[PDB]
From Swiss-Prot:
The chain holds residues 71 to 361 of 361 of the full protein. This is Cytochrome c peroxidase, mitochondrial. The modification Phosphotyrosine is found at Y150. CCP1 precursor is processed by the rhomboid protease PCP1, which cleaves the N-terminal hydrophobic transit peptide. The m-AAA protease (composed of YTA12/RCA1 and YTA10/AFG3) is required for CCP1 maturation: m-AAA protease promotes membrane dislocation of the CCP1 transmembrane segment within the transit peptide to ensure the correct positioning of CCP1 within the membrane bilayer, allowing intramembrane cleavage by PCP1. Its EC number is 1.11.1.5. It comes from Saccharomyces cerevisiae (strain ATCC 204508 / S288c) (Baker's yeast).
Amino acid sequence: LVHVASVEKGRSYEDFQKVYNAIALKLREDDEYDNYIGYGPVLVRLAWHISGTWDKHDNTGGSYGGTYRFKKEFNDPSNAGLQNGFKFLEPIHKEFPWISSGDLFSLGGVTAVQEMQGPKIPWRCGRVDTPEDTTPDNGRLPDADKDAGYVRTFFQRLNMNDREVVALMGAHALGKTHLKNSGYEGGGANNVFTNEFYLNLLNEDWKLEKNDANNEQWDSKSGYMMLPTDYSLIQDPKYLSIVKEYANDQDKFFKDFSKAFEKLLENGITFPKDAPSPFIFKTLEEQGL
Ligand code: HEM
């Protein structure tokens, strides 16, 4: 399939900065969500899951068509919990009805990363809502009870290499698992974007335990947890080298995450040669708002 980005009619940077601001102000306002984590991490997870359905082989799935809005995808077991992100964005969509669904879901992720003190993520508009029959079947998102070889093969479908996979996974510094969503038990959580995922992988004393859903996960006495696929990044020697790199260089992690996350959000989209350049949105803080 070819999906050509089409700018929402007459819109420019200032329009999208307004949408960014509305999302950011609501992120600040709705601070109580999920035991005071706020909506930042679930917005990042939503932007990833609406993108992570992409298949490079036939260009099905991906963020372009906004298909998460349709019941098949909305009800994917892999997406359990994401309804909260969708509900958060609903009033934003209603205030700015001109923005496409894929643009809104992906921008929500960019906004959340930046507002949580993450790197700037350049972002491009022009995703166009596609019909219900374009919604990808369930089962394209990854399982957590797997090893490094699984992770590496899985991400080849999204055209991501080892460095991109390790960078993207640093998002698991954010938020938590919820037993009722995924069968993984979380505890403490953070809503500030840092490279701490890599530091925790290397520095904590991990114990392989069974949780209350009878699934294995790696736990530390500090109350930290890792999925088996997280832990695989220190079991595989190629992933381990990159983990160490990011643990020792915050700026390099930020730069690599920004590139990979934009790429993830743009996979499947053809941008015309005279499309606008990617937008870099100012944070609320930078605007004095
Ligand atoms: C091997 C690949 C991955 C697997 C198996 C995986 C699995 C999971 C699972 C099981 C959860 C818990 C969901 C819940 O119980 O609420 C989760 C949460 C999350 N994921 Fe991943 N994930 C992967 C990659 C990624 C990527 C690439 C990103 C973004 C760059 C990401 C961002 C997040 C975030 C921010 C959360 C927390 C959401 C919240 O706190 O509500 N994940 N992931």
